[PDB]
Amino acid sequence: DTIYTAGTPSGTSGDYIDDELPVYQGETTQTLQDYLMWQVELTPFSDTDRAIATSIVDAVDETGYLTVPLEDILESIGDEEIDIDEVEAVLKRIQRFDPVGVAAKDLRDCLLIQLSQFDKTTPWLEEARLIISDHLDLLANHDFRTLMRVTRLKEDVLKEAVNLIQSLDPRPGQSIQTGEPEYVIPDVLVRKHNGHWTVELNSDSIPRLQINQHYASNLQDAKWLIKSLESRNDTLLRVSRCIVEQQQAFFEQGEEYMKPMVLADIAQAVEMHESTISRVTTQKYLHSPRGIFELKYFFSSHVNTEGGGEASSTAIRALVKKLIAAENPAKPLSDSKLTSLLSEQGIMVARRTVAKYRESLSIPPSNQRKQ
Amino acid sequence: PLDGGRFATSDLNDLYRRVINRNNRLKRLLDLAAPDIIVRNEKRMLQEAVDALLDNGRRGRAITGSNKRPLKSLADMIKGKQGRFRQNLLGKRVDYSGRSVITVGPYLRLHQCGLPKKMALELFKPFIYGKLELRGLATTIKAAKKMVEREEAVVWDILDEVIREHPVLLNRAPTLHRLGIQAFEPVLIEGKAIQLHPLVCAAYNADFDGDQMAVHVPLTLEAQLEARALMMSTNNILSPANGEPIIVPSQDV
Amino acid sequence: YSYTEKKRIRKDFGKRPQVLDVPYLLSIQLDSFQKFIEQDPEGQYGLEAAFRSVFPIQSYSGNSELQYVSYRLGEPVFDVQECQIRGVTYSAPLRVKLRLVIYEREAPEGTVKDIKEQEVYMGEIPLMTDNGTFVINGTERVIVSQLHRSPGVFFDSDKGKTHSSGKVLYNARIIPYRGSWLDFEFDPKDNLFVRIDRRRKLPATIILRALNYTTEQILDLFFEKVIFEIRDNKLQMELVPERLRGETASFDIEANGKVYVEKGRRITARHIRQLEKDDVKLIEVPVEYIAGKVVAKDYIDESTGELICAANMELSLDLLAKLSQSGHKRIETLFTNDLDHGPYISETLRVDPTNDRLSALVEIYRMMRPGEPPTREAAESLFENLFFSEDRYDLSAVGRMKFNRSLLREEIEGSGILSKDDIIDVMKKLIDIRNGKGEVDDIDHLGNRRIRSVGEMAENQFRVGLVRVERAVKERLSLGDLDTLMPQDMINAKPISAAVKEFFGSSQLSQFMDQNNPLSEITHKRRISALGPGGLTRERAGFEVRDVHPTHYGRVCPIETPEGPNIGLINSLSVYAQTNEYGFLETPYRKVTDGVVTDEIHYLSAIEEGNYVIAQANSNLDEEGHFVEDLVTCRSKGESSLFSRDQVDYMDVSTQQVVSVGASLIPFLEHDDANRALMGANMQRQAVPTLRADKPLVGTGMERAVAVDSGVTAVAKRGGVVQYVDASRIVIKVNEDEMYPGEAGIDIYNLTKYTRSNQNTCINQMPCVSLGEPVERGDVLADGPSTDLGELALGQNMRVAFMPWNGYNFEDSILVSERVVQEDRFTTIHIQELACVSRDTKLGPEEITADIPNVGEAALSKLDESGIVYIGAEVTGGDILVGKVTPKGETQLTPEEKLLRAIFGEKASDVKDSSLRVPNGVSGTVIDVQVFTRDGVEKDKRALEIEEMQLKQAKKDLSEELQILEAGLFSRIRAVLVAGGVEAEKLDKLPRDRWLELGLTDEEKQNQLEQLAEQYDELKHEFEKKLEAKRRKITQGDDLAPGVLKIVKVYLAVKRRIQPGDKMAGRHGNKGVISKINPIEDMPYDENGTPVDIVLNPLGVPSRMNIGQILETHLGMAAKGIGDKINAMLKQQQEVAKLREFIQRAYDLGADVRQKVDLSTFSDEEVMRLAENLRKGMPIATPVFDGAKEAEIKELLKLGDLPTSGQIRLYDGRTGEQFERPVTVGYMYMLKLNHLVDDKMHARSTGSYSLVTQQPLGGKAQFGGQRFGEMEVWALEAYGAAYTLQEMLTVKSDDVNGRTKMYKNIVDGNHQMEPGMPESFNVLLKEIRSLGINIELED
Ligand SMILES: Nc1ncnc2c1ncn2[C@@H]1O[C@H](COP(=O)(O)OP(=O)(O)OP(=O)(O)O)[C@@H](O)[C@H]1O
Ligand SMILES: Nc1ncnc2c1ncn2[C@@H]1O[C@H](COP(=O)(O)OP(=O)(O)O)[C@@H](O)[C@H]1O
Ligand SMILES: [Mg+2]
């Protein structure tokens, strides 16, 4: 029960003229495909070219890359006289629309398409063209040495060519993006006072409906909805409070202090069917000083503890992250060494499990992290 | 669609949900073979729900959803001043149109009007695209679009070329007679206000103390020839209700 | 004169004395809210009444109760400026003390077992600022007053429009302050009927029966008895003469052997007088006379025991014989005459079927509660709760007063619940009205309409919340552990706060304040609206309520009203109007006793005013007070006529007590048409403030009142000397005698600099005082927007000529010189605010940084390290103001994604750009950035810099106060040391710290030194504590909405110039549009080569009948002339004697003016500063209806050596040739209205379309198209242009494929369309089909 000491006003008048607002209709928007089709219409194609262009633009993703191979498109046309070279010509024509480089098969194609539209006066263009055309994995893997051998070029020219490479656009289709992203309103709040975490539902999201009972059946049915809503929010609050009580240590000391709890614990604690617990916690979030977390985030698997008990997979992931974050660049830690290092604190996880956790956290293996 | 990724049901959806719920309850009671005294009131309530859906408020009390406001039904969607007939079929909003304040140009000839060029650039844009492509200044549509966006030094010459003999329609509300819409030839001026010939104001009932005007652009050849041959300001000297002249000097003249 | 008025004295041409000074213009709001808040021991106004209305609360078992004791309002957390900057409500916390008492059982009455007292919280109450405004969610709001029908009883009638016979129907309506209405009505057949809450019509006698009444009692109440006697012979009658008025005899009137009237002869007044003189009582009447007389009471024979006849029944011959033979010699009947004493109640009983008490009650229950079987006890409870329950029906004190006044009673006090007597008297008065006695009421009378202000409405809303709180409380109080619970556990703060904030933020009468200029604010606050809850509607108003009523004189402005659909429903208060203790408007009048006009002021309301004779302010008087003529023009009983001297009772106080403020700011009002006066008053409040304010050369003297009483200027709280003046702050050293003890006497005034108004204009205060000069209490220190030295100043004085100029001023156009543009006379500043909010998401916290991945370095030049633009940067459309990155997502990835992350970094693949950019077509300079970060989150460099900037000022203020106090203490310590015989020169050379580094002798000297050291260290500790507290306040974290991290607000400022298409106007309803900016060498010029500034059309003066402007022009020229003379005396160093002599000669000019100016009391410096202020023209005041005559204007023109006719000879600027006729040149006060062509201009070729009907959107903010309505279609049909119409209907609006094909063909140089079918028609077909009706195209 506090008052927000700062905020943003809403741009509108407090009172509206008494006439009723018109029914909501909507408003059209321009996505990438709409722009591409608009440019297609104003382009001197034939009829078959226009059909192939429609089929191609249909299969362009949000980033502007062509998701299907050309065989799918030529099959989708449904004609037999049309060959694959016509599809190639139409695709090459489409790839030069605005933004330049859209509908590209892969990154190499996009970069080459963008590079082909420069002027010859550019200081280092042929070097960049050759590097993209032939030796790309060398630039990605940060070799900088065998690339010097193959290119037969000194340091300065290669550095400038790489500077030109990192000046292009790898996602040309995201210039025309969505207007404004959505945001989620939290359902419950967990504050702390008296050394304890208080749990309370969002007041700004829970109004009390006016009871329409004066014309009095219908009154009893209306009260049934009230009782159902009461029971629903009571169940939500009880489940959230029990979950917060179980995971007290995490709320204080952050990660590496969760407990391996499953739906059975909640079902036995609140005396309810586990299906109801699964139903109520789906697509609902809680706001903590640490962030916003889905109500189902605290359930996970476990691993055996040598001294006794179990360790949350979230704690293992956090420990792996913190161990990797403080490794030596000269000799990055490997999976077996990581397992050996963690097998001193009672953590007993197989090498396969460590690999799965590392893949989940999206960290490159040791050989790609060496400096 | 509200904020937060959530939605609120409209009036038609509310009425549909109500009739569906009543129908489901009545069907379940019919399957159960409940006493008839209850099925009577259930059928009456379903009848009321259907009647409210089809035409809300015609018989009995009008159903309201919130703030004591009646819910629009299909009949209200069809009829009234806000219905389809009198709001979207007999009159509609159009493209290639603009509006602004009007001033007086005492130098114009009877078939001329003064148009700001920032409005003329926006109104005549596709013609500018076509003219730019025609003489090779832009091999593609995107190049012409970018060139027009930058407002380069040649798009003004192109704009002067594309509006040489191309009438535009000037309108001022309320349109009480057929002389409320008249076609003129544009002259590009610097400013943000339309300039109007002093001899046509009496026909428009227009004075220069804050009046605004709307301007529309004909597109097809037939529309341009109709504007020049039927709606031009030089063809409307005599009044269609009197036969007396309406292009008549007043005040200072 | 005050010091601020001695700098520039405005010459006054008024002639009538001022006896009452113009009051404070904002009393109506402040007094009402003060009444709402302040404690009231009597408990009738404010929160005390609301608290006592519902409390005490007793549970159903009656075993415990809650008892309110008192309440209290705490201190606001923030200030008005801080609340506006942050964007939070300026409110106070409500703390209320309650006591829960517990009762027992098995004991007589109620013993005190346990009483528990607790102070609880009830919510936040918003507070009213010093200018009668509320700050709700960062924006200032105004709650306007309501004009509503007062509670009580009203008698009305329809004017025969309900019946084709044209017979008028009369009704009486009782409307309470809270409860159910009551209606008595007459029908075409003369049968009284009752009605409750506009439900089904019911017989009137039902109410009488429900109150335990019998039919005989009703007939006694509503009729006059007549007694028939049977004195053993032919029913001899006791007759009264007056009863025979209007009667035609049907028998022989004979008594004492004299036939007074013969049979068949009409009874005349002479016969009545003869009967009165002769004292005739015994009259023999035949039995035939009893054909229709109705018996009063039921009659039974003694021996039989049966009933002879029933009451309310006509007597017959056989019944007469039956009663006569039954020993009946006395019978009772009713007097039912046609012209008077009508028999409406009897026929009402006849039509009424009920004849008992319970059946009527059951019928009432069935009528009010249909659809269920009745019940005796339920019906009784419903009837009791209807009109006699204090919890549902209340007639307020004003309601009771009006009720008693409408029934000619004596007392005023009474009960808010009804009684039998009140209803009986209501029916009696209605019947008397039906019988030609009395008259209906006039609803538009201002003695029947009441003013309801903000305090009363807020109190009503608070009570409405409190009753819900009571309903909730009654549940918890029923059962529970009576010990471990507390009063806090029973209350629930949410409903009260919800209701109060809903009323203050989303009500119909709560609006944003108008902030174009001070006049807009003053006018908006003094407004009376008939709309809103409990009021009229724009559709059910009528036509008589929208017209001037004779009772509006002196209370409501007749001129000021909004044209349009809201005409007559919105009003503005007059200058002197007040309200009663009940809420009725009243106006002041001087009292005239014995033909001598006194100075005693009485406030009269609408009802009292009609019963007197009131003179006019125009009447002339002698020095001692007598009238100068035998016949005086006066108002009486709604009329105006002539009266004798001794007949007069009262007199008006001022000639301007009829108009409002905006109308009273117009010079030469009486020479203007009323419509033009209204137009000028409306346009005068839409004028935007300009760069430099300019006083009006011709005013009315109401400028200073509007300027000071608006709250836009910093006025000194106490007198003193200006210690420190700066362009951003003023520090005044208060005089010794006005200082409070134990206080360093200084006032600190912080001026507001370049802040945003509700209309995106500029609010900026400038100091208008010098260093070290005296100021007295009430003087003005700073000039707000549109103010010059404390005088209201909305526009600029322009040199204007009236003549046609080559058609550039044709049809209300305006020709403006180029020198006007070159001097920035009509240049304005506009300020805009844009906000960016970084919040939390499920994929991570949105971040604010300058490291945006896909944006080049060029766009990031103007951002700092934190990602926020620098102060002073010039921005245009598309520039990045605040850079914000939003987490894009997280996936299992893919080899191509791994390659992209490896080559182009990880951050570029984790987040996407969501920065804040300047909207297209916007420009300005960044003048202010504000940052709010949620508590606990680490701050950034920008926020820390802003906090340091904020802390510096608080430290400076505290240092100023502390240093003054320290100097005061050091004076005393030095004096004590010197009185101790210390080495004076040694301490003079020693620094002030070395003064403390000493000691005194063993006498009381050392005691004094110790005392002053204690005081010094105590003061230092106290001010260190103050500094720490203010640092804590500044460095405090921010509690924001959940999920929100940071908020950044950026302010842009731009300057707008004048151009063709802008709208200008004067004060006399002469509006126009600028058409051309003529170069300087083309404007017409006079003999001296001085050009004119603006050229207007003469033809527009006579056709509009706003002659006053012309007069203003003439007088304006005169004023300017005076200035020129003074200016000439300053370019050449003339001595002060000639200057002051000429200024005095100018001020003394006039024909018996009321202003006496004596310059001999002025020092030469004051005279020189006055001449410096007057060198640009002497300002002149002409009151509205006591202005300056033409002769005075001609004399003033003669004084300045200008032609008297007001017309000079102008020359052509292009050819140098003199115009053939003299032209009128002068100075007029021009304004710049808020209709800028920058906002109107709009065009569109193609954009976004609606989702359902596929038609273009509407509006400039939506980038929409222009509507082509039905009438334009009719015009195109009349022309015969079918192709234009077809391409208007399909290819421009709805043909989804037609639009695309048309665009493609236009790009290809091929102009041709292929129309299809509009989508709206398919939508219509679907909507018709959804009704169950088959409609289709065919063939
Ligand atoms: N409710 C309305 N419906 C339709 N047209 C309206 C309405 N109110 C005003 N108008 C239009 O506004 C015009 C009035 O013009 P304007 O306001 O410029 O002043 P005016 O009548 O020419 O007089 P002046 O300029 O001398 O004060 C009318 O002729 C009419 O066309
Ligand atoms: N309701 C209306 N419908 C159509 N035109 C109007 C209407 N009201 C005013 N106008 C025209 O628009 C012009 C500008 O009006 P505006 O300035 O908005 O009114 P006002 O001068 O009363 O503020 C006026 O000259 C008038 O002729
Ligand atoms: Mg006009």
SS (H, E, C) C1193-1204: HHHHHHHCCCCC
Question: What is the location of CATH 3.90.1110.10 in chain C?
Answer: 151-223+342-442
Question: Which CATH superfamily hosts domain C151-223+342-442?
Answer: RNA polymerase Rpb2, domain 2 (3.90.1110.10)
Say if CB C684 and CB C665 are below 8 A apart.
yes
Quickly tell me which residue has 């604690």 as its tokens. A269
Binding-site residues on chain A for chain B (CB distance < 8 A): 20, 22-24, 39, 42-43, 96-98, 182-185
Strand partners, C721: C733, C774
At position C304, the amino acid (one-letter code) is T
Question: What is the location of CATH 2.40.50.150 in chain C?
Answer: 827-937+1038-1056
3-state secondary structure of A25: coil
DSSP C689: P
CA–CA dist C1054, A283 (Å, integer): 47
- The hierarchical CATH code for the domain C655-711+787-826+1057-1240 is 2.40.270.10
* Ligand nearest the Cα atom of residue C676: 1
Cα distance from N-terminal residue to C-terminal residue, chain C: 93
Strand partners, C573: C556
Binding residues of B: 207, 209, 211
CA–CA dist C1301, C1315 (Å, integer): 9
Q: Six-digit token pair at C302? A: 């003694």
Question: What is the location of CATH 2.30.150.10 in chain C?
Answer: 574-654
- The hierarchical CATH code for the domain C712-786 is 2.40.50.100
Cis amide bond preceding C853, omega within 30: no
Chain A's closest residue to B65, CA to CA, is A212
Spell out the residues 6+ positions from residue C639 whose beta carbon is closer than 8 angstroms to its own: none
Q: Six-digit token pair at C33? A: 């809210």
How much helix, strand and coil, in percent to the nearest 5, is found in chain B? 40, 15, 40
Sheet holding C152-158, edge to edge: C152-158, C169-175, C182-185, C193-196, C202-203
**Any idea what the Cα angle at residue A46 is, between residues A44 and A47, rounded to 5°?**
130
Residue A150 C-alpha from the chain's centroid: 38
Residue B219 CB less than 6 A away from ligand 2: no
Cβ neighbour number for residue A280 with a 10 Å cutoff: 18
CB pairs under 8 A between B and C: 248
A169 touches chain C (CB under 8 A): yes
Binding residues of B for Mg(2+): 207, 209, 211
Residue B136 CB less than 6 A away from ligand 2: no
Spell out which residues of chain B touch residue A29, defining contact as CB-CB under 8 Å. none
Say if CB B8 and CB B38 are below 8 A apart.
no
Question: Which CATH superfamily hosts domain C574-654?
Answer: DNA-directed RNA polymerase, beta subunit, external 1 domain (2.30.150.10)
Cβ neighbour number for residue B118 with a 10 Å cutoff: 16
Q: Ligand 1 test: best mutation among B205, B211, B212, B251, most atoms within 8 Å of CB?
A: B205
Test A2 with C1039 for CB contact under 8 angstroms: yes
CA–CA dist C2, C778 (Å, integer): 9
Test C505 with A8 for CB contact under 8 angstroms: no
Residue having the nearest C-alpha atom to atom 11 of ligand 1:
B174
CA–CA dist A93, A43 (Å, integer): 10
Test A189 with C1042 for CB contact under 8 angstroms: yes
List the chains bordering chain A where 3 or more Cβ pairs fall under 8 Å. B, C
Spell out the residues 6+ positions from residue C1314 whose beta carbon is closer than 8 angstroms to its own: C1298, C1301
Testing the interface with B: which of C816, C1075, C1279, C1311 to mutate, by most B Cβ within 10 A?
Answer: C1279
Say if CB B147 and CB B139 are below 8 A apart.
no
Q: Six-digit token pair at A361? A: 């956290």
Q: How was this structure determined?
A: cryo-EM
Of B152, B135, B7, A89, whose CA–CA distance to C1309 is shortest?
Answer: B135
CA–CA dist B85, B88 (Å, integer): 6
The phi and psi torsions of C1047 (rounded to 5 degrees) equal: -130, 130
CA–CA dist B218, C1284 (Å, integer): 7
Identify the helix (H) or strand (E) that includes residue C51: helix C47-54
Spell out the residues 6+ positions from residue C1142 whose beta carbon is closer than 8 angstroms to its own: C1125, C1126, C1129
Cα B92 to ligand 1 centre (Å): 25
CA–CA dist C695, C790 (Å, integer): 10
Concatenating the DSSP letter of every residue in C810-839 gives: TTSEEEEEHHHHHTTTT-EEEEEEEEEEEE
C23 vs C27, C702, C708, CA distance in Å? Answer: 8, 12, 12
Cα A18 to ligand 3 centre (Å): 28
Question: What is the location of CATH 2.40.270.10 in chain C?
Answer: 655-711+787-826+1057-1240
At position B104, the amino acid (one-letter code) is V
CA–CA dist A101, A111 (Å, integer): 7
CA–CA dist C775, C789 (Å, integer): 14
Of C711, C444, C474, C401, whose CA–CA distance to C556 is shortest?
Answer: C444
Each as own residue / partner, the long-range contacts of residues B70-75 (CB below 8 Å, 24 or more positions apart, any chain) are B71/B11, B71/B14, B71/B15, B72/A23, B72/B11, B72/B12, B73/B11, B73/B12, B73/B15, B74/B12, B74/C1327, B74/C1330, B74/C1331, B75/C1331
* Helices marked H in C875-1003: 895-904, 941-979, 984-989, 992-996
C639 vs A224, C614, C650, CA distance in Å? Answer: 67, 11, 15
CA–CA dist C1170, B95 (Å, integer): 63
Beta strands in chain A (DSSP E): 188-193, 196-201, 285-288, 291-294, 302-304, 310-312
Cα B209 to ligand 2 centre (Å): 9
At position C960, the amino acid (one-letter code) is E
The phi and psi torsions of C1321 (rounded to 5 degrees) equal: -70, -40
Beta strands in C485-526 (DSSP E): 510-512
Residue having the nearest C-alpha atom to atom 25 of ligand 1:
B209
Of C1328, C1255, C1294, C1326, whose CA–CA distance to B78 is shortest?
Answer: C1328
Q: What region does C563 belong to: left with phi over 0, alpha with psi -120 to 50, or beta?
A: beta
**Any idea what the Cα angle at residue A150 is, between residues A148 and A152, rounded to 5°?**
65
Residue C473 C-alpha from the chain's centroid: 37
Strand partners, C528: C145, C571
Concatenating the DSSP letter of every residue in C1256-1287 gives: B--STTTT-PPEE-HHHHHHHHHHT-HHHHHH
Closest ligand 1 atom to Cα of C676 = 27
Say if CB C1256 and CB C1293 are below 8 A apart.
yes
C517 vs C665, C794, C1053, CA distance in Å? Answer: 14, 8, 18
Spell out the residues 6+ positions from residue C35 whose beta carbon is closer than 8 angstroms to its own: C45, C46, C455
CA–CA dist C1209, C1225 (Å, integer): 9
Identify the helix (H) or strand (E) that includes residue B12: helix B11-32
Residue having the nearest C-alpha atom to atom 1 of ligand 2:
C564
Say if CB A303 and CB A348 are below 8 A apart.
yes
Quickly tell me which residue has 């005169």 as its tokens. C1118
Identify the helix (H) or strand (E) that includes residue A224: helix A218-246
Q: Are strands C1094-1096 and C796-802 parallel, antiparallel or unpaired?
A: parallel
Cβ neighbour number for residue B26 with a 10 Å cutoff: 15
Q: Six-digit token pair at C403? A: 């009720």
Rounded to a whole number of angstroms, the distance from the CA of B27 to the nearest CA of chain A is 18
Spell out which residues of chain C touch residue A1, defining contact as CB-CB under 8 Å. 493
Test A2 with C914 for CB contact under 8 angstroms: no
Buried b (16+ CB within 10 A) or exposed e, C828-837: bbbbbebebb
Give just the sign of the alpha carbon dihedral C1127, C1129, C1130, C1135.
negative
Closest ligand 1 atom to Cα of C1103 = 26
Of A67, A3, A201, whose CA–CA distance to C91 is shortest?
Answer: A3
Testing the interface with A: which of C537, C903, C910, C938 to mutate, by most A Cβ within 10 A?
Answer: C903
At position C429, the amino acid (one-letter code) is K
CA–CA dist C875, C920 (Å, integer): 11
Question: What is the location of CATH 2.40.50.100 in chain C?
Answer: 712-786
Say if CB C488 and CB C620 are below 8 A apart.
no
Closest ligand 1 atom to Cα of C1069 = 27
Question: What is the location of CATH 6.10.140.1670 in chain C?
Answer: 938-1037
Q: Ligand 2 test: best mutation among C1235, C1266, C1267, C1272, most atoms within 8 Å of CB?
A: C1235
Of C1252, C1333, C1325, A23, whose CA–CA distance to B73 is shortest?
Answer: A23
Test C1040 with A141 for CB contact under 8 angstroms: no
3-state secondary structure of A279: helix
CA–CA dist C1157, C67 (Å, integer): 66
Spell out the residues 6+ positions from residue C41 whose beta carbon is closer than 8 angstroms to its own: none
A85 touches chain C (CB under 8 A): no
Of C478, C484, C466, whose CA–CA distance to C58 is shortest?
Answer: C478
Spell out the residues 6+ positions from residue C630 whose beta carbon is closer than 8 angstroms to its own: C644, C645
C87 vs A10, A371, C83, CA distance in Å? Answer: 11, 52, 5
Least CB-CB distance to A185: which of B4, B82, B141? B4
CA–CA dist C1049, C973 (Å, integer): 52
Say if CB C1157 and CB C13 are below 8 A apart.
no
Fold of C827-937+1038-1056: OB fold (Dihydrolipoamide Acetyltransferase, E2P) (2.40.50)
C899 touches chain A (CB under 8 A): yes
Closest ligand 2 atom to Cα of B210 = 14
Beta strands in C726-790 (DSSP E): 729-734, 746-750, 755-756, 762-763, 766-767, 774-775, 782-783, 787-788
Cα B211 to ligand 2 centre (Å): 7
Residue C676 C-alpha from the chain's centroid: 24
CA–CA dist C908, C853 (Å, integer): 5
Q: For C938-1037, give the CATH class.
A: special
C237 touches chain A (CB under 8 A): no
The phi and psi torsions of B173 (rounded to 5 degrees) equal: -90, 145
Residue B209 CB less than 6 A away from ligand 2: yes
Of C1037, C1029, C1032, C1035, whose CA–CA distance to C958 is shortest?
Answer: C1029
Test C512 with A294 for CB contact under 8 angstroms: no
Of B111, B236, B240, whose CA–CA distance to B248 is shortest?
Answer: B236
A119 touches chain C (CB under 8 A): no
Of C884, C803, C808, C790, whose CA–CA distance to C844 is shortest?
Answer: C884
Beta strands in C558-637 (DSSP E): 570-572, 578-579, 585-593, 596-605, 614-615, 631-636
CA–CA dist C497, C495 (Å, integer): 6
Testing the interface with A: which of B64, B125, B142 to mutate, by most A Cβ within 10 A?
Answer: B142
Say if CB C1287 and CB B92 are below 8 A apart.
no
